[PDB]
């Protein structure tokens, strides 16, 4: 069974990943502990990034050197006030189990933590300007997670070397999820003093990003929302390619579930004033159904294509992106 320290790690996985912990726990063989630990170290790192009670001066040394703390048996952090702070307060338990992983997994996790911490620190003081900068921010906080997971799958040999080698596709898996979250979380981010929507895009509608929360600006807000969702849809071909290459059932389910939830979220958000002025619902018997069904390529394609079809026939002719939205959805289906 499990050591006392690993039992604790799985407790933290359940506390932090909730319903998704079961999907990680279903991973075959060596992948299970490797991904559990990777998830927990990523949670610790993100908890630092997100904690607005930690000054930039105090935070940057932690982000820069986080990858090194993996090799410091007594390193912990006791001052977080964030939801998942227990993984920081009891980091020694997590790092102990990290150091018990095979070297091949340690190398991947440490490298990703290094690169993510540097990129997270770079964006602390700045807003996202260009669409290219949006892609770069998303790479740092999510694309690298896709790349790291892919490298774990290939290192374990439960998946082919191609999976880890194709960093563009693995990065796209992360960007799709992260752009969907950023789109959905406009209001909570704005209220938390954070700005993630790219200025290159929103400045073609309003003078400040926070203006989209003003009711008189709702039509403009929804146009911008639709433009960003159109941007995110461009990652779907890569998501389909990525999922199509997986040969391990447990890996497939782990990779497919978040992507199906993302496309469902985009479809809920598309053309939806509630992003700015209310609360977007994704009917939650639906979330469990998508999870249950997303276990083979024909099923996952069916889900993706149906949500795209629903968006497609909802596109207003007057939307300034209406043509590109139809085009990208049409193009993906044509593929
Ligand atoms: Ca974060
Ligand atoms: Ni149609």
Curated annotation (Swiss-Prot):
GO molecular function: metal ion binding; squalene synthase [NAD(P)H] activity
Pathway where this protein functions: Terpene metabolism; lanosterol biosynthesis; lanosterol from farnesyl diphosphate: step 1/3
Membrane protein topology class: Multi-pass membrane protein
Membrane-spanning intervals of the chain: 250-270
Domain of life: Eukaryota
This protein's GO CC annotations: endoplasmic reticulum; endoplasmic reticulum membrane; membrane
Free-text function comment from the UniProt entry: Catalyzes the condensation of 2 farnesyl pyrophosphate (FPP) moieties to form squalene. Proceeds in two distinct steps. In the first half-reaction, two molecules of FPP react to form the stable presqualene diphosphate intermediate (PSQPP), with concomitant release of a proton and a molecule of inorganic diphosphate. In the second half-reaction, PSQPP undergoes heterolysis, isomerization, and reduction with NADPH or NADH to form squalene. It is the first committed enzyme of the sterol biosynthesis pathway.
Name this protein carries in UniProt: Squalene synthase
Higher taxonomy: Eukaryota, Metazoa, Chordata, Craniata, Vertebrata
């Amino acid at each position: 069974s499990l050591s006392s320290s690993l039992k604790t790690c799985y407790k933290y996985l359940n506390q932090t990943s909730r319903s998704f912990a079961a999907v990680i726990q279903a991973l075959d063989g060596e992948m299970r502990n490797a991904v559990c630990i990777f998830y927990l170290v990523l949670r610790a790192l993100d908890t630092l990034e997100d904690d607005m009670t930690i000054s930039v001066e105090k935070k940057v040394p932690l982000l820069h050197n986080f990858h090194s703390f993996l090799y410091q048996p007594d390193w912990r952090f006791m001052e977080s006030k964030e939801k998942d702070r227990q993984v920081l307060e009891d980091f020694p338990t997590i790092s102990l189990e990290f150091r018990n992983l095979a070297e091949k997994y340690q190398t991947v996790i440490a490298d990703i933590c290094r690169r993510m911490g540097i990129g997270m620190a770079e964006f602390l003081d700045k807003h996202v300007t260009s669409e290219q900068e949006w892609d770069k921010y998303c790479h740092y906080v999510a694309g690298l997670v896709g790349i790291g997971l892919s490298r774990l799958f290939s290192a374990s040999e439960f998946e082919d070397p191609l999976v880890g080698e194709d960093t563009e596709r693995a990065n796209s898996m992360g960007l799709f999820l992260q752009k969907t979250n950023i789109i959905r979380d406009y209001l909570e981010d704005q209220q938390g003093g954070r700005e993630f929507w790219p200025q290159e895009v929103w400045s073609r509608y309003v003078k400040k990003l926070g203006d989209f929360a003003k009711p008189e600006n709702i039509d403009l807000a929804v146009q911008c929302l639709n433009e960003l969702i159109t941007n995110a849809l461009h990652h779907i071909p890569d998501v389909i390619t990525y999922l199509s290459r997986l040969r391990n059932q447990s890996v497939f389910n782990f990779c497919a579930i978040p992507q199906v939830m993302a496309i469902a979220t985009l479809a809920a958000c598309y053309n939806n004033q509630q992003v700015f002025k209310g609360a977007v619902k994704i009917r939650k018997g639906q979330a469990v159904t998508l999870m249950m069904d997303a276990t083979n390529m024909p099923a996952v394609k069916a889900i993706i294509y149906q949500y795209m079809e629903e968006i497609y026939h909802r596109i207003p002719d007057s939307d300034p992106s209406s043509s590109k939205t139809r085009q990208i959805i049409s193009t993906i289906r044509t593929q």
